[PDB]
């Protein structure tokens, strides 16, 4: 195979390089030194510059040099609260717990610090989806009101009983 296998090794190398704390960007040839890809094609080099490192949402460019994107990913509690508030305001949906866990190492500390700010929905495949706790409207009732509300059934009753009950009670 050719032209479709070396890109996975490159993105794995610079991700692990970023895990070591290398914030400074690296050139194309500097990455190619330690990946054992010195015999890579020239048409692959131009394809990486114009497509691969600009469509990937994990790569950003500083003065022509490429690096990881730690600003987009979550790395602290304050960015987690800001991003979750932005998803609530614009209505872009929640974020899975596994996405936060891989972006933010030791994310359990940020979860327990925020506490009730993060709403957890349990998917059937053990996954969790995080939602913002919009504290503008916080109304809660006792569990005995919940089972009393569930006791009365309205799904199996026609609309003519609902309209007649208003005139039956005289309102």
Asked if 30 and 36 count as a contact pair (C-beta separation under 8 A), the reply is no
Among 116, 143, 155, 160, binds another protein (CB under 8 A): 155
162 binds another protein (CB under 8 A): yes
Binding letters toward another protein, positions 82-111, x by CB under 8 A: ---------xxxx-----------------
Q: Confirm or reject binding of residue 54 to another protein (CB under 8 A).
A: no
DSSP 44-103: HHHHIIIIIHHH-TTEEEETTEEEE-TTTS--SHHHHHHHHHHHHHHT---EEHHHHHHH
119 binds another protein (CB under 8 A): yes
Q: Can you give the binding site for another protein, defined by CB under 8 A?
A: 91-94, 119, 121, 123-124, 129, 131, 137-141, 144, 148-149, 152, 154-155, 159, 162-163, 165-166, 169, 171
């Amino acid at each position: 195979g050719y032209k479709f296998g070396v890109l996975a090794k490159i993105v794995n190398y610079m991700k692990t390089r970023h895990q070591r704390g290398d914030t400074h960007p690296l050139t194309l040839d500097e990455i190619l030194d330690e990946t054992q890809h010195l015999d890579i094609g020239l048409k692959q080099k131009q394809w990486l510059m114009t497509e691969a490192l600009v469509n990937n949402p994990k790569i950003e460019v500083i003065d022509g040099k490429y690096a990881f994107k730690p600003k987009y990913n979550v790395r602290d509690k304050k960015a987690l609260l800001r991003l979750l508030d932005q998803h609530d305001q614009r209505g872009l949906g929640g974020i899975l717990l596994e996405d936060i866990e891989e972006a933010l190492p030791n994310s359990q500390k940020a979860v327990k610090a925020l506490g009730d700010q993060i709403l957890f929905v349990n998917r059937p495949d053990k996954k969790k989806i995080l939602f913002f706790n919009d504290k503008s409207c916080q109304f809660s009732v006792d569990e005995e009101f919940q089972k009393l509300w569930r006791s009365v059934t309205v799904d199996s009753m026609d609309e003519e009983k609902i309209e007649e009950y208003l005139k039956r009670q005289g309102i």
